[PDB]
Design a protein around this ligand. Structure first.
Ligand SMILES: *C(=O)[C@](NC(=O)[C@H](C(=O)O)c1ccc(O)cc1)(OC)[C@@H]1N=C(C(=O)O)C(=C)CO1
Ligand SMILES: *C(=O)[C@](NC(=O)[C@H](C(=O)O)c1ccc(O)cc1)(OC)[C@@H]1N=C(C(=O)O)C(=C)CO1
Lengths: 246, 228
């Protein structure tokens, strides 16, 4: 990505909560990014829900998802989470990480096309093995904070191998905070509580569009208890708040 | 839209603030609308700042505007009036006039200065015409590229929530004259779950202190309706 510099100051936010994780921030572009840990910044973790971003783009590119206004009909059958038991729009499905909607999209896309696009997007290790509808939920797919940032930058610039149209559609679906001075696009992820001495990973990736400047970020941390999720946003938020970004 | 129904009960929020104005709320699924006053819903007023929406679309379509990053959202949000007066100048009266006709925007009267006709000129548009215009935008049905309509749609985002996204733009023609108060606007649409709500609000105004009401009143109505 060119270069990545360490920023020891941000570490306090991690120690305070006794959290092991990383934060990567890049101003203007991925040419110059700062982080609190050079090693972890490029370490690859299961993307979990953050994979819904590329999954949505591929869905539109392949025609599997007709257009930005397609409704994902609930068939009445029981779903893992109550917030998924109802019809959903693309933005709706992304915001609540509606697994079954994205699993149906993945199956329709198929393994050959999914592989092809992850290669075009240089998405992490590009490993989709272990089942077309769950590789990003419990498979071998892995991606780093640095790679996430590069991927989001391409999206922001409409440089991914997809129509500008489809890229714009997904970007609007990722808006999570709007303010007169800045628009925030982001996506959270959580692999789970993990196994015996093998914690899961929690994510928060996205970018902030200001008046004349854009900031790209990616955050991930280890986690063994779901009651820790709040940290996934507070730490990065507290940091970006410190930089005057948000 | 498909139909409109008058509901005088909303006048509640209007009397409370002692304000003369109208609110138009349309449900996309049922294609039906509701308003506290049918007559004023069709009354056409100066679009003011709300004109930036069609303005921005025309600017991109005519190439006068680089791209969403040129940023456009900054141009529509972080004031800078001269910025859009620039775009209008470059667009020209011939093209500008052509797009408003394609858009079926108000009375399509752009006389009195190609760079201020929407601020003090003869251009007039009703609340109903605003929601119809915004619906065409939402459906990418305006005579412009989908890409440009999408760019403008995101630039107009003013509130994001897990369950909904609000797109909107305010308007203000000034305190006006004596028995001729100015007009304040708040138009936009809300994407709430799988439903879409288009809205248009305007009120007579002679004091900038009451300016906050253009958002305040419509917001209370959409809350009581469980929109936002
Ligand atoms: C996305 O990250 C999320 N969870 C998972 O993808 C994850 C998995 O299967 O890998 C999971 C699934 C079910 C569980 O009971 C626990 C973990 O949903 C697709 C979602 N994202 C969250 C987040 O904000 O990070 C959540 C708190 C809940 O899961
Ligand atoms: C419209 O947005 C604009 N500005 C205002 O109306 C602004 C406001 O209400 O927020 C305001 C209010 C009271 C004041 O005394 C001064 C300003 O007015 C038309 C203006 N118009 C633009 C345009 O392109 O039409 C702009 C780019 C900037 O804002």
């Amino acid at each position: 990505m060119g270069s990545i510099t360490e920023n020891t100051s941000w570490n306090k936010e991690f120690s305070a909560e006794a959290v092991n994780g990383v934060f990567v921030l890049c101003k203007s572009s991925s040419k110059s990014c700062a982080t609190n840990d050079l090693a972890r910044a490029s370490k690859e973790y299961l993307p979990a829900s953050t994979f819904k971003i590329p999954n949505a783009i591929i869905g539109l590119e392949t025609g599997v998802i007709k257009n930005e206004h397609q409704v994902f009909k609930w068939d009445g059958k029981p779903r893992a989470m109550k917030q998924w038991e109802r019809d959903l729009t693309l933005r709706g499905a992304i915001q609540v990480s509606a697994v079954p909607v994205f699993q149906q999209i993945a199956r329709e896309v198929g393994e050959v096309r999914m592989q092809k696009y992850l290669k075009k997007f240089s998405y992490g290790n590009q490993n989709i093995s272990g089942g077309i509808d769950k590789f990003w939920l419990e498979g071998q797919l892995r991606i780093s904070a640095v790679n996430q940032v590069e991927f989001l930058e391409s999206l922001y610039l409409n440089k991914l191998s997809a129509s500008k149209e489809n890229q714009l559609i997904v970007k609007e679906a990722l808006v999570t905070e709007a303010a007169p001075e800045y628009l925030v696009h982001s996506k959270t992820g959580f692999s789970g509580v993990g196994t015996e001495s093998n914690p899961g990973v929690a994510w928060w990736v996205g970018w902030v569009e200001k008046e004349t400047e854009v900031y790209f970020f990616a955050f991930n941390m280890d986690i063994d208890n779901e009651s820790k999720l709040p940290l996934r946003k507070s730490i990065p938020t507290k940091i970006m708040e410190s930089e005057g970004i948000i």
